[PDB]
């Protein structure tokens, strides 16, 4: 997988520093940023347990949109079932601190970009945050970064027929990082091995 130190260096290389709050566990409080773009990488587990899975949250203060990009695109019920993760409190806190009307639009990905056995979740979150820092009104799709990868229905995550698309996404992710991150370039072989497409495949 990816450690926090790795993800912070790569998000800084991709130009997201001006908006990046850092890496957090499931207790990420939410956004206190009524007038500034902001984003964060958040784990589904608590720091006590050790990391489990990475997601990215991002906030556009002009449209009052809170984006959630979790690389498998699970539904809210599946996030609670699979990872015991819920994010109602951070949405509530974000709306009360950051919008005079106490309302926001939540826009969340509903497709998987990551293979079921891949350990590249944190790297996909970095890639989405480059998309957000440059296209904060359309980060999920229809932008030069996200056009390199292709989501598939989360209900088809384990089906053979979507694997080539998910493997192509992983290849495009690593190539994107080679062109934009000196830190990834200098740790290329190591990060590709620790995050590989079938890193977690059953034996």
């Amino acid at each position: 997988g990816s450690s926090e130190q790795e993800l912070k260096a790569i998000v800084k290389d991709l130009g997201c520093g001006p908006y990046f709050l850092g890496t957090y566990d499931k207790r990420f409080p939410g956004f206190v940023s009524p007038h500034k773009l902001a984003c964060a990488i958040v784990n589904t587990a608590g720091r006590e347990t050790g990391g489990v899975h990475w997601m990215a949250f991002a906030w556009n203060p002009r449209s009052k949109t809170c984006y959630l990009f979790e690389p498998f695109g699970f539904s809210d019920q599946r996030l609670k079932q699979v990872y015991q993760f819920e994010y109602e409190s951070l949405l509530r806190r974000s709306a009360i601190a950051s919008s005079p009307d106490r309302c926001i639009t939540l826009e969340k990905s509903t497709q998987s970009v990551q293979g079921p056995n891949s350990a590249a979740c944190g790297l996909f979150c970095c890639m989405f945050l480059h998309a957000f820092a440059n296209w904060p009104q359309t980060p999920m799709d229809h932008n030069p970064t996200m056009n390199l990868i292709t989501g598939v229905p989360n209900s088809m995550l384990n089906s053979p027929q979507v694997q080539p698309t998910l493997r192509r996404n992983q290849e495009q992710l690593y190539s994107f990082l080679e062109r934009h991150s000196p830190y990834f370039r200098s740790h290329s072989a190591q990060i590709r091995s620790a995050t590989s497409f079938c890193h977690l495949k059953n034996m």
Partner: peptide, 11 residues
Amino acid sequence: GVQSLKRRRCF
């Protein structure tokens, strides 16, 4: 990229 769902949430 990915398709997404939008939901308005007020508190």
